[model samples]
Target: MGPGFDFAQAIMKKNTVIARTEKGEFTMLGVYDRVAVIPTHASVGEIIYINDVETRVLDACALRDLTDTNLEITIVKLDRNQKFRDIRHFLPRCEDDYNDAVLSVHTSKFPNMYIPVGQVTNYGFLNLGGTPTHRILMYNFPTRAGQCGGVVTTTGKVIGIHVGGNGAQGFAAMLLHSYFTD
Candidate 1:
């Protein structure tokens, strides 16, 4: 992270812009457009480059809780003035379900995110590259409505994927690094 491309600076700038809204209050109106795409697949975890510099993960988890059976999911980049895209569905294999399957819905399209519960811990890996790499643990999950796909950070490094919350106090979430590989 260079002085010209500080994440904190960028966040501050974003906050400033949002704070300048109609009544000079913090607003979610135009915040989605400033969101940077974080790329993570089965092979590569969340990747972000600020000032052309790549960042490594530290730690992250949702601020909420979730059930062991359901995954909480949401959109990461949504424009408040625009209508949210419909959630898409995909059937994935579950470890416990020899014949049963889990349906993963691609809820938010801007960030194209999802959460795979019921077997989040079943997928694990060892340190193979010999380099110090951050690993993702359990997701804390969210406890509110329509707060899915929010950012989760540990020491400011994003590490968790927040889905949504339930009626009681629990929320749904998944480990961000669990979706990536070496």
Candidate 2:
């Protein structure tokens, strides 16, 4: 699809800002081909950019994943009206780790940072969790608690959604090929 955007450079944390609303803060997983993906924790009616570029959260719907709770993601579509805002979509993925994948996350100090989330697929593929454990276990995750909603992408193609993590291991919502659309 015209090569899309560079998976590494295009997937910046600038677009991955915190959506602050009257309720609380929600981590935005940035835009992928115009569609915004956020955690189900997001509440509607959140506004951003103030009067200049202010936009409202139009709707959010969770794509059901019965097995893995960490993989549970809500698609967020913002109402920008006729205004022009910058957002990029995810690129295609045919090779898995042929090129290094990137995990996007940020903290108060470091605004935009890419941690080394090495791909260590246990079992047959990515351990999409066992039972209804509410977690998708994986290795080499560069995140800790409160790091949910980060996009784990490989070569611009999203592979996992950083849901939650502990000191012991990490969890994400596996975005398998069966899950995404063409």
Candidate 3:
């Protein structure tokens, strides 16, 4: 496997937390490299923890019909159980409406490296004057909704988050570090 090839599974094992509404309780599962079977009852605003770090995930879309709906989500790191903090909006789309949406995030930091080829989406464009050109497309898992506001990397450290996209061929935008700090 390649880098981030097993990220989904890795994250599920090492950094996932589950909150069960039926029980009205919180359960923390330790890290493992296999995908944890999330139950169908999990709903919107439920938090999934990776390695005890709570990350907020929106379940606006149902789990049974994951493919049809785009996951509207954001990942946040909380400070204490009492309050939710350190929250950052992940990949944000450029368009207010989805009919002709162009997904993108403002780049806070420049890329450490750029892969001209082998990039999943090569049509990425920067928005200088008008519409954005370099768009990146996220490949969703066959069983899960698209990953939004999650980490992206060139050399292991997270460089960005996977945001939105457009076109007959879907494209994506990475919310860079600069956008977060600034």
Candidate 4:
């Protein structure tokens, strides 16, 4: 439908970020985009892959919701320095009240491919098979291919990040506070 996440655009256009948290280890933003700017957090550490523009995402760690398990969110803050590129100017504010929802698979294999406007819900507690996969909403089908870490967006606003699925059908999380803070 829409041109999709625009990897070619977001990459050059920049702005998006790649986050990682290894438990006790401190998290960090590798690159600096104009839009990925957060003012409160500090940028002291360094990670090669994340900052390396040539490099791609590092599995689910980047987009995985570290803790936004409910309505009350905790946005990951940066020092407003910005990461990646495309210097975005605005941080969209959205509302998610048991509503619906990247995202493309935009997947693990074909990380650059795009997909149609996905259809999933924001169950928040989407425990499809028992394990609570913070995957905002599950996929409409049973299996989605390579897609994971794909981003989801609405009209002029980012909505979520696709976690995983098949045939472009995947799950994503709403643009929670954990995504835009600082």
Best by TM-score: 2
Runs of candidate 4 exceeding 4 Å displacement: 1-13, 16-48, 51-82, 85-102, 105-108, 128-130, 133-135, 138-145, 166-169
Tens digits of per-residue lDDT for model 3, 1-182: 44443433333233334433332222222112222222222332455543335554432222211233222222233323332222233224231111111211111121111221122433334341243333344432221123223333332222233433332222334333233342
Ranking by TM-score: 2, 4, 3, 1
Worst lDDT 10-window in candidate 4: 22-31
Regions of candidate 1 where Cα sits further than 4 Å from its true position: 1-142, 170-172
Clash-forming residue pairs, model 2? 32-89, 33-89, 71-173
TM value for model 1: 0.25
Q: Tens digit of lDDT per residue, candidate 4, span 1-182?
A: 33444432353234444333221111122223322311111221232223323332222123334484332122332434334442133223543532222343321234344444445565555542344545355446444433334445543445554443545344554554445343
- Model 2: lDDT of residue 136: 48
Model 1, total clashes: 5
The TM-score values for the models, in the order shown, are: 0.25, 0.62, 0.29, 0.49
List the global CA lDDT of all models: 0.25, 0.51, 0.30, 0.37
Collision count for each candidate, in order? 5, 3, 23, 25
Model 3 residue 90 lDDT?
29
Choose the strongest candidate by lDDT.
2
Weakest 10 consecutive residues, lDDT, candidate 2? Answer: 122-131
